[PDB]
Amino acid sequence: ALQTIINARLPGEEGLWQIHLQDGKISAIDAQSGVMPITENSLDAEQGLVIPPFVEPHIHLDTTQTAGQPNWNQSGTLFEGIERWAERKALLTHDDVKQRAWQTLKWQIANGIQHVRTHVDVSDATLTALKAMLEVKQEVAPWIDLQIVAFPQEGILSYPNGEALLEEALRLGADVVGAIPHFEFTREYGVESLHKTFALAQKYDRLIDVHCDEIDDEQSRFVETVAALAHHEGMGARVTASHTTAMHSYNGAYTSRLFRLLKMSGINFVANPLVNIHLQGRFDTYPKRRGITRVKEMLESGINVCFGHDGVFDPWYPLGTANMLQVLHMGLHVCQLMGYGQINDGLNLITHHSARTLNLQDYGIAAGNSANLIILPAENGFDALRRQVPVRYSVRGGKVIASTQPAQTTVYLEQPEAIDYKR
Amino acid sequence: ALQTIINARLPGEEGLWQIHLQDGKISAIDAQSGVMPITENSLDAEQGLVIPPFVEPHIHLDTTQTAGQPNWNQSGTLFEGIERWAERKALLTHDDVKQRAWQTLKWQIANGIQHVRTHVDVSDATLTALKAMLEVKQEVAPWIDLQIVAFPQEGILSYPNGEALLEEALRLGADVVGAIPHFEFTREYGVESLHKTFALAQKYDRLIDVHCDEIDDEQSRFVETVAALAHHEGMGARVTASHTTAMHSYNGAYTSRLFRLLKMSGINFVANPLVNIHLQGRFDTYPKRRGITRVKEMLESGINVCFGHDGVFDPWYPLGTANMLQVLHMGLHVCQLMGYGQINDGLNLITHHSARTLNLQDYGIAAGNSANLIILPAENGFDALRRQVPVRYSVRGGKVIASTQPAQTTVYLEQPEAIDYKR
Ligand SMILES: O=C1NC=C(F)[C@H](O)N1
Ligand SMILES: O=C1NC=C(F)[C@H](O)N1
Ligand SMILES: [Fe+3]
Ligand SMILES: [Fe+3]
């Protein structure tokens, strides 16, 4: 088995590094003063970048691969998407869900993703998708640590037996309690639904991840209740507010007041660039707002924010290959995080910040941690992002679980020339 | 007595029809293949349009005919109107109210209106107008079925003994429970007032009709509580939200979310075009908003919406002859329902949709129903609307209760020529 990763570059560090492995864990990390020779049991990073695994903090594996079934989301809105999904949800079968979830999970393994948080719609008395996903979680465990969010897609108080079904999902083993306050019939139901969500999370000792204010409504401020309840309960690390796209439309004075609470609360934020740019701004004519939450300001304020893919060929998103560098690319452009350092540091949005969002306890290139790491054939985050590089090797427990032999491009000029798009 | 209505056109139907009458009811409806000859006991529609009676779903008979007494509403706003009305309310007498209400009711009978819902201000310890209106209801019964809404004009929680007076009005016989959440001192009083309104409606088995969000305030969203409470209680058919002019100013994303609840709830909506275009937009300079609720979108979504006159020469409206085709004309223009089919189908907004709003159980040209119908000297809804035709005959219980001999216009050219404005 592998004993060392050599010739590795690490974000924020100068030079090359060697990562020693023992019993499936990282035993030590030592700097190199030059290039080390390869040998059996040594995986050569070849002066590429070594980082802990990519993370998918927000995806819907129960809906993945169902776009157009039985109908397409014509308007490209969150609301029609939920209606189209309702039609598909009525046709779910156990094997259907497992097969589609596994198809996307394999793309994720290929893309160096070893941690995934999937929401699963539990506004369904049969809990068909949840039962299937709980089996998938066990089956995929050797390659991906899958967290399941009990997501009451049609509301907690606004759907028949919504609260009972949400609790049933937790009793069956869901890892995270979800909610969707802006979809509840009234603002009061929205606020009350959050009190119920927090009570369930404390009763069962589970994490929280709310689909929060995913709407271009400047009056949708459920995020302040999520943050205040987390602060009151002293549980910010365990709480996440997904989307918060309404924040894109808030006035600046309220946002400034709010940011103090967001920081004090310690809660996490997920932005979903590919889906947000598509679903938000649909009620504007021109000009049209971008609709992504205030990622740049969160980073400047030290508030933990990260990026998810959200949908992969489903009612809310017709594209995708479950590639986090592609998600990152979209987010950096739409959020205008286009300075060299902002782009280079972008990898944090799909690695460390996402691990914090998932409350991971064994993550990072550090002595004592499990030997879970990936190798990118690039010099730094900027280079990896610019060239949209594949994952050369994905290592888990000290063993290679995925590898990509890069494409080879040649142009035939006066003489053949290899093109790698580098400078 | 009349035995048949012949040569009748019916909305949405081709050709001519004969309506057989027996014992004050419609016994059968049969198609004709040509024009039928007149005879005694046959009322000839003369290829005009026969429809169930016009309906007035929202009027204030306690304030009708009082404009300028003792002062005029100078600003033309809802707020000053309430202040001017307060001055007039202090001068009310039993006979005063009965005489004015009857004057407008006679115009309504002349205009083919056989169903009227009048709001009556019950923010008055003496309940003077209500006592008078309860007598008028009995007196006008042979010609008009009058519903009375106990309307707490100055608020339920924001007026001394408001709730007690509202309940007293129901104990005296008011048919419908009213409310005015946007006029309450606070948003919290507004929401609480709706819980009290619904509790009273369920306690007494009465209908509900709320003056809801009649204000150009994008934050006035009491309509979501009206719809949610109706859905919770399973009583949408019995509930109406009048005005909802704030909806004209909502962002599109919130409106889309809201519409799902509006449809699921089954509640009714009343727009009051003549008054709304006058009272709304008064705080804008230029451009100036129209201020009518989202009638076009409600129709496209299958949400029941209809039109009322609201005021006839009162604090909120200096004009009127209580003519529903005139109300319809204004609404079609301001709401931009100007396509041929939209205009032609406009009659639904002042007939069937309004009957549903009043929860009527005996309405429509159908076998078994009471023989209540009117004849318009026009080819279809479009023609009736374009030419603002009078009601040729109004029939109730199989007897003629009103008739209008149309005006006769002649131009004296090289020879005299009759002009009917038709093509
Ligand atoms: O409520 C939602 N369901 C599914 C999505 F993809 C979107 O994140 N929002
Ligand atoms: O609150 C109100 N009172 C009277 C009117 F005419 C208007 O409908 N609104
Ligand atoms: Fe989502
Ligand atoms: Fe009114």
Swiss-Prot record, chains A, B:
The record gives the effect of mutating residue 310 to K/R/H as: Loss of enzymatic activity
Positions binding Zn(2+) in this chain are 58, 60, 211, 310
Where substrate binds, per the record, is at 153, 316
Identify which residues the record assigns to the active site.
214
Q: What is the effect of changing residue 153 to A/N?
A: Less than 0.01% of wild-type enzymatic activity
Needs which cofactor?
A: Fe(2+); Mn(2+); Zn(2+)
**UniProt xrefs under Gene3D superfamilies:** Metal-dependent hydrolases (3.20.20.140), Urease, subunit C, domain 1 (2.30.40.10)
- Explain what the record says happens when changing residue 310 to A: 17-fold decrease in catalytic efficiency with cytosine as substrate and 2-fold increase in that with 5FC as substrate. Shows increased sensitivity to 5FC
EC annotation?
3.5.4.1, 3.5.4.-
- Free-text biotechnology note from the record: Cytosine deaminase is being explored for use as a suicide gene for cancer gene therapy. The cytosine deaminase/5-fluorouracil combined therapy has been used successfully for a variety of animal tumor models and is currently under investigation for the treatment of human cancers.
Result of mutating residue 310 to N?
A: 35000-fold decrease in catalytic efficiency
Enzymatic reactions: cytosine + H2O + H(+) = uracil + NH4(+); isoguanine + H2O + H(+) = xanthine + NH4(+)
Give a GO biological-process term: cytosine catabolic process
Q: What is the effect of changing residue 243 to Q?
A: 200-fold decrease in catalytic efficiency
Which InterPro entries does the entry mention?
A: Amidohydro_3 (IPR013108), Metal-dep_hydrolase_composite (IPR011059), Metal_Hydrolase (IPR032466), Metallo-hydrolase_Enzymes (IPR052349)
Site Activates the nucleophilic water — annotated at 243
Which keywords appear in this protein's UniProt record, sorted alphabetically? Cytosine metabolism, Hydrolase, Iron, Metal-binding, Zinc
- Its biological purpose: Catalyzes the hydrolytic deamination of cytosine to uracil. Is involved in the pyrimidine salvage pathway, which allows the cell to utilize cytosine for pyrimidine nucleotide synthesis. Is also able to catalyze deamination of isoguanine, a mutagenic oxidation product of adenine in DNA, and of isocytosine. To a lesser extent, also catalyzes the conversion of 5-fluorocytosine (5FC) to 5-fluorouracil (5FU); this activity allows the formation of a cytotoxic chemotherapeutic agent from a non-cytotoxic precursor.
What do we know about how this protein assembles, alone or with others?
A: Homohexamer.
- Protein name per its UniProtKB record: Cytosine deaminase
Q: Which organism is it from?
A: Escherichia coli (strain K12)
Please spell out the taxonomic lineage of the organism that makes this protein.
Answer: Bacteria, Pseudomonadati, Pseudomonadota, Gammaproteobacteria, Enterobacterales
